[PDB]
Amino acid sequence: SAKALIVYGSTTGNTEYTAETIARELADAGYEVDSRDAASVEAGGLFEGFDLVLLGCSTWGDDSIELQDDFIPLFDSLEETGAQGRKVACFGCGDSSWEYFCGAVDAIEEKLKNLGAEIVQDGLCIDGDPRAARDDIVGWAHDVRGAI
Numbered sequence: 361s362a363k364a365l366i367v368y369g370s371t372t373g374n375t376e377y378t379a380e381t382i383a384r385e386l387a388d389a390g391y392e393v394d395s396r397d398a399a400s401v402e403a404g405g406l407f408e409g410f411d412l413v414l415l416g417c418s419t420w421g422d423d424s425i426e427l428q429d430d431f432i433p434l435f436d437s438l439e440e441t442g443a444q445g446r447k448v449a450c451f452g453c454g455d456s457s458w459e460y461f462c463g464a465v466d467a468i469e470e471k472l473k474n475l476g477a478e479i480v481q482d483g484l485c486i487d488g489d490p491r492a493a494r495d496d497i498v499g500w501a502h503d504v505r506g507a508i
């Protein structure tokens with residue numbers, strides 16, 4: 361079967377829950393899903409062997425757009441991950457009280473495109489408690505699968 365990698369940076373658990381929800385959706389559809397906390401990964405060759413890569417990251421920063429801390433090293437070395445020609449999609453939790461709502465997702469997408477990835481679906485941005493967005497999360501995973 362096709363193999364999917366999900367890597368998530370999450371501090372309060374929201375993007376982690378989102379990743380777990382996406383993983384079950386893909387696994388139910390027949391994907392072999394490898395889900396990893398970004399804190400545990402190294403960037404070099406990270407995407408090797410994977411037909412689909414899903415990257416999740418929350419947004420931070422006192423008065424700038426900053427990526428979740430565990431994701432920053434992966435972003436900083438994203439050019440070594442094997443993203444060229446890779447089918448990728450991005451997701452993240454945020455808070456719409458911030459103007460740059462899920463700004464980290466946008467930043468990861470833009471760099472992926474420079475690096476030659478194929479963005480298979482527009483990034484998923486979740487407001488507030490992601491358990492109150494379960495339908496949106498499952499639907500997005502479904503749409504990602506249908507777009508590859």
Ligand SMILES: Cc1cc2nc3c(=O)[nH]c(=O)nc-3n(C[C@H](O)[C@H](O)[C@H](O)COP(=O)(O)O)c2cc1C
Pocket residue numbers: 369370371372373374375376417418419420421422424425428453454455456458459460461462463488
């Ligand atoms: C200092 C600070 C800055 C934040 N900045 C943003 C932001 O710019 N855009 C956004 O969408 N959310 C912002 N947030 C909201 C967090 O991303 C939100 O709490 C999210 O649910 C955390 O997801 P996680 O538990 O997966 O880490 C900010 C939160 C804090 C504390």
